[PDB]
Amino acid sequence: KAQEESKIEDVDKILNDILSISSECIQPDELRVKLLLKRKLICYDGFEPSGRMHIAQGLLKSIIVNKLTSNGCTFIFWIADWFAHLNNKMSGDLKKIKKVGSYFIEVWKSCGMNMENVQFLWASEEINKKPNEYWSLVLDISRSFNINRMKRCLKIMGRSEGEENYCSQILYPCMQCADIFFLNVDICQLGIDQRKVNMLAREYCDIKKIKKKPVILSHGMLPGLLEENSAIFMDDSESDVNRKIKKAYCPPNVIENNPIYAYAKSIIFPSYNEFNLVRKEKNGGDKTYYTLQELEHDYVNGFIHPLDLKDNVAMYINKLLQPVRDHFQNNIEAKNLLNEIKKYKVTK
Amino acid sequence: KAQEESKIEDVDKILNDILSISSECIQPDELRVKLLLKRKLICYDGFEPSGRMHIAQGLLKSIIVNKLTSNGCTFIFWIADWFAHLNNKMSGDLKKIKKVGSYFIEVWKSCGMNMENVQFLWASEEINKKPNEYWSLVLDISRSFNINRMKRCLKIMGRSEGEENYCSQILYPCMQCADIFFLNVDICQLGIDQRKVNMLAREYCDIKKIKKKPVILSHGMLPGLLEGQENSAIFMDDSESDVNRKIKKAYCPPNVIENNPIYAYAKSIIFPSYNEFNLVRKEKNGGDKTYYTLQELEHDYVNGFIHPLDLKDNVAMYINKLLQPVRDHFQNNIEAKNLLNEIKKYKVT
Ligand SMILES: CC(C)c1nn([C@@H]2O[C@H](COS(=O)(=O)NC(=O)[C@@H](N)Cc3ccc(O)cc3)[C@@H](O)[C@H]2O)c2ncnc(N)c12
Ligand SMILES: CC(C)c1nn([C@@H]2O[C@H](COS(=O)(=O)NC(=O)[C@@H](N)Cc3ccc(O)cc3)[C@@H](O)[C@H]2O)c2ncnc(N)c12
Ligand SMILES: [Cl-]
Ligand SMILES: [Cl-]
Ligand code: NA
Ligand code: NA
Ligand code: NA
Ligand code: NA
């Protein structure tokens, strides 16, 4: 027959693709086993509703999510409303956190996630449907690890250790760890800045002799726009994008920590399977890049000047944000929601 | 007009009465104010179902609760089953913890308390009836205090600082603090070893601008039977000979009251149980005598008018009389006898 061989090849391809969009996988052979389970894998990422959405959580997220769901997975977006509250976001105000969460969902559905295999789940709603199960997990995790081990998860709250260490910094990682089991996740697909608590979950499996362990499929962090005006938001207008890109950090010849180059490589190139650099002839002229290898060689050797990369990145970000811009300009309810949340003060 | 004066006098009597069963009150002025509210005050104590019941948690508790419920209070016994589990009691085993909690309730119902204003509430059951309210309190408390402040509450878990500090030692005090608000308590009536988390609740009110603050009415810790404190305390299932053997060997310094745990039993359990202490002695040792005030009893023993061994002999027989109706419940009620049999087989962790 040879169908067996064809299925092995199919699995190898799905595995190479799933691994492609990741900066790290813990562990690849485990991911291969999960796939042979012959079933939809559950992936998830989670989000504090803390203010307008940075393009990392919309444009970049949509690329990874569509890759995974098109390869048979279901993807949960965990709107971590209680976590934002625990982390002092939006003045702790749950009404504001809820409005922001609603705005997140509007963004995601207009930026490539209006689809059957993506679920938008609210942490508070889901915890309160099964609160004995949820909080019993949280308490059992807290019994298994000492305070220092848990303090090492502080990066998941976006915090440095030099500040005051509130007890919330213990509860939050216990709860994020519980989420991984509570949602029956196969793949934790969060930014690499979440790795500590994802590793904690794997350690908890070993402690409890739980053989079903989650695969950590972490994506890379987009560097900050600068080395409000500090990030591109998913709702930004064309002039807002143009202005923020013009002033962004884009060191000549340097890719490390370069946000402009990161947008080209991680958002724009996968979206178009190319990068078209429009330039005057005296600056090298237009050029179409078909590989990231050439783009990197050309930027590192100075063939691409920062101003040219910036102009092209701005044009592409505006093209990619068009359906979001249009949704929030033309849909009256979404326009009114954005107008409300834009007035909120951003806290921590 | 004569009614106004009489209302004041009544409150003063009730205040001094409630305060008598306490070793510390934070604060008496606040308790007076609570007493003027013209509604029942909610009091509570909570208990990890962890093994045998200490005589302090059965006989002494019933003396205190009877005082409070006859003085305008309602009293909650909080069966802290999830806390026992969090604190690694009974192998963490929630089935054993539930069995032991059932046994505690059986004991308390035979301990001589007026039950019309007493409730037995299970932590897990009540929390899961209102889990959004409860866990939102827990998280807000955790946002309000730093880790070091919460580590200083470790005594409430019966643990020493030299050991490994599991994160459960942070969740537990946040949760005990939450209980105080979740149950809408007016008076936290626990042992003085719970003071840190009770102080935490008060501080939390100040932080949140909550003017309704709980009064901490702490009772004293009953000392261990041996000098400087199994054989270190009476438990609620102990037999008459168990009591006799443990009291007989207890520390009872002749002519000295301080740290004499026998005297601690006379003063905190027996005297409030009988509104007196009737000291039986042979005529050659002074003959029987009734002390009607603790000042009187203390005066006679500190000056050597009371033989230590006479205090032991009576403390033991009075403790035996007091445990009799629990013994009877567990001999004659068949389901109770078997519950006690099962829970005595548990390994204490
Ligand atoms: C803009 C910056 C903040 C950023 N975030 N992310 C990624 O977005 C996601 C959200 O982030 S978050 O809202 O801050 N939430 C958190 O941290 C979590 N604890 C919330 C949570 C998660 C799971 C739970 O079970 C419970 C709670 C993460 O996967 C970040 O790793 C990026 N990815 C690439 N480049 C970037 N610059 C960024
Ligand atoms: C056994 C001995 C040490 C002792 N205990 N108690 C007193 O009994 C009670 C139980 O104690 S416990 O079962 O250990 N539970 C705990 O500690 C709590 N954290 C459980 C809890 C409570 C309220 C909550 O909202 C949540 C959880 C306390 O009031 C002790 O203070 C004594 N009173 C006088 N003399 C004594 N020798 C003793
Ligand atoms: Cl449940
Ligand atoms: Cl509720
Ligand atoms: Na969907
Ligand atoms: Na974060
Ligand atoms: Na050109
Ligand atoms: Na204790």
Automatic annotation (TrEMBL), chain A:
EC number: 6.1.1.1
Keyword hit for Metal-binding: yes
Signal sequence residues: none
Keyword match Transit peptide: no
Record-level GO cellular component terms: cytoplasm; cytosol; host cell cytosol
Places the protein is found: Cytoplasm, Cytosol
A biological process from GO: tyrosyl-tRNA aminoacylation
InterPro entries, A to Z: aa-tRNA-synth_Ic (IPR002305), Rossmann-like_a/b/a_fold (IPR014729), Tyr-tRNA-ligase_arc/euk-type (IPR023617), Tyr-tRNA_synthase (IPR050489)
Function: Catalyzes the attachment of tyrosine to tRNA(Tyr) in a two-step reaction: tyrosine is first activated by ATP to form Tyr-AMP and then transferred to the acceptor end of tRNA(Tyr).
Protein's name according to its UniProt entry: tyrosine--tRNA ligase
Organism: Plasmodium falciparum (isolate 3D7)
